[PDB]
Amino acid sequence: MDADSLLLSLELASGSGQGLSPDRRASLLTSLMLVKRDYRFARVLFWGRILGLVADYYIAQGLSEDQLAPRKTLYSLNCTEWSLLPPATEEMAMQISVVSGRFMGDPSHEYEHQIKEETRLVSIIDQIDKAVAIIPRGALFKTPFGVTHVNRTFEGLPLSEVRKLSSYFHFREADFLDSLEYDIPRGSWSIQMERGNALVVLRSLLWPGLTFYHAPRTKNYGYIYVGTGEKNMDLPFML
Amino acid sequence: NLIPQYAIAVLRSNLWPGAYAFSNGKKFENFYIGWGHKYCVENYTPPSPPP
Amino acid sequence: QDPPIERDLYLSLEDLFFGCTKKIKISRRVLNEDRYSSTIKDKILTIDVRPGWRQGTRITFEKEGDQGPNIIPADIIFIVKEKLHPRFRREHDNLFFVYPIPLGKALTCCTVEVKTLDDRLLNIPINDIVHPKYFKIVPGEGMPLPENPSKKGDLFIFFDIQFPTRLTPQKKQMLRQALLT
Amino acid sequence: QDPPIERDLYLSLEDLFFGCTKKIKISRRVLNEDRYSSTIKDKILTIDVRPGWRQGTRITFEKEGDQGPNIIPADIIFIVKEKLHPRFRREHDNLFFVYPIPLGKALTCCTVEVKTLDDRLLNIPINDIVHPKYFKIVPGEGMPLPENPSKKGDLFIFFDIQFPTRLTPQKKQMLRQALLT
Amino acid sequence: DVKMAHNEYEMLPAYEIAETQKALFL
Amino acid sequence: RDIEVGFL
Amino acid sequence: MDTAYLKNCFGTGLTQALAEVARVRPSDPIEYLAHWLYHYRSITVA
């Protein structure tokens, strides 16, 4: 989510209940502004949290012009001390498949199944972005120059279009993006209305902790993954 | 943590995600905000039928 | 005929990263039809330095160098050469940074502060135990390629570990209990 | 004349330390007094290897090679070289010993066990903090001089520091309190 | 279809406050 | 060859 | 003549190329032409 989600508690307004304290919120505002300074990103959205057993990894994601670029991930344990997380590949996706369990706060932790916790952080954040990173329909407009920009004239979805999974897009490489109605399982997405139905909350069931914010009246949107960081393989049993 | 002499003891169960316990050192309260499920490292095995 | 003068001109990393321009005043040994004069017709040669030009990249100006009465002038202003920096060593489209990490920070979690050629600052995590052959690749963040200025190579961060110069006997017991167990 | 028969005299550091004898079979290639015939006895050349001979010193046998049709040969079996001993390598007049050392012993002192070419065990104390770029000179303990078989060079004991592969959080706090202060 | 067919950088006064205010969180 | 008159 | 070969091969492309170059008047028309032809593929073939 953008900085507008850190001037007000947009995260906890979704009713998921997990988010940032005002301490972390103000610290994150200053730190993500400094990240946009130090790293010349077009925008610096707060990706979310990986709730560990010792400390939580506060995650930020760099956005280029060129928003479907291979987005650059950053991590921080004490919020402000932001550090450039390495990018993800297919080998590191295959590497962590033998490991299961909750994240440890120290990213130097080792698993004997060695495997670094930093590699787990990189791979799990990549998997969450490829699976359940949400963009509402029409928020991004494929520019004729081979580059994706913000559709800066985007009006929020009509309330008729709110209830359809077709009106929401996977924020990744592929109206250009893939819609959520093919995201198997068919019931894998939960759509609910809060705050007088001026608020659409769309939570991932396959990756619990994701909660996508959207205000239909305006263009205020964003997604945050605040959760344990594992994939709910039990989803078809649970549906 | 920046002002530790006014901190509140946070507890994260890791058995029921979203379950929390809190205390300023004198009073306390409990709160659950999860999906209502127990955490398990292993994938959910449906139980076998009776023999 | 007489050879072209293989002039060497030094370019720092930011000049070959951003694609600067350079001017080199040339000789005044240009001949008229009389074939004994010494004048100049073009004082300055300009080279549009593009990003990613490697060392040894030859830029040649035919018919611009010194000229005798019956030979064709030529000149090879300039062979691309790299200045010393504080610090990245130029290799084939990769930058090699040396961080003087102290010991005790080498063996534990560390964050390396790298100013880049973009005037961007990087906090690179180092969660591995930094022995004196370790290097972390920060991919896609080196200098631009000469064949593609949009794409850039990888940044290599090597480590020069500073061992302690003196240890208390308490510090000797500290270390012996820690490392040899 | 016909070119020399350039051959490598293979000798280990123990043999150049003590000295030896080596025989090289030429053998059945010289042209005999039959005018001409290559059938020759198994002629042999002995090289009395004296102690302390350097790598590359030339041993030359005049007229002992494959004699041609009235052509003066020379069986130049000459390069003294160079077998990498399991414990030492050789520079000029100096044995360079590489001791793999763990980091705890590198920092909190040790004793190095050197088995020499003479079959002596040297317990060399190391009580300086072993930098990666660290060596100790054990003088008078190298190989013998070629110019003087009573005098000896210097032994150099370099170190290959073995850092730990895993450190627990207790071990990380251990090191942090120990070194970074 | 018509849209088909050495760079300096400037930045706002909002990061000198951010430069100033990180000391609050350290 | 003579494109100078032909095509330009 | 060789007109017919290059009748078929180039056609509209060189026309638009020098029309744009004459309109813009860049400092290096030849480099501008090369870059424009690259871009002209990047729109047409793709």
Author numbering:
A (entry chain P): 1 to 113, 133 to 193, 212 to 276
B (entry chain O): 615 to 665
C (entry chain K), D (entry chain B): 136 to 316
E (entry chain R): 257 to 261, 271 to 291
F (entry chain L): 285 to 292
G (entry chain C): 1 to 46
What does the paper say about this structure?
In contrast, the RS head-neck dimer consists of two copies of the RS head-neck connected by the arch bridge of Rsph16-Rsph16’. We then determined the cryo-EM maps of the RS head-neck monomer and dimer at the consensus resolution of 3.28 Å and 3.57 Å, respectively. In addition, in the arch bridge, the Rsph16-Rsph16’ interaction appears to occur in two areas, involving electrostatic interactions between their C-terminal α-helix and hydrophobic interactions between a part of the DNAJ-C domain. The M309I mutation is located at the Rsph16 dimerization interface formed by the C-terminal α-helix. The mutation of Met into Ile may disturb the formation of the arch bridge and impair the stability or even formation of the head-neck dimer. Our local resolution analysis of the RS head-neck dimer revealed relatively lower local resolution at the very end of the Rsph1 arm and the peripheral portion of the neck. To further examine the intrinsic flexibility of the complex, we performed 3D flexible refinement (3DFlex)49 on the head-neck dimer in cryoSPARC and found considerable relative movements between the two monomers. Specifically, Mode 1 obtained through this analysis mainly describes an open-and-close movement between the Rsph1 arms of the two monomers with an angular range of Rsph1-rotation up to 12.5°. Mode 2 corresponds more to the seesaw-like alternating up-and-down motions between the two monomers, with an angular range of Rsph1 arm rotation up to 8.2°. We then fitted our high-resolution cryo-EM map of the reconstituted RS head-neck dimer into the cryo-ET map of RS2 in the head-neck region, and found that they overall match each other very well especially in the head region, and the lower portion of the neck may potentially contain additional component.
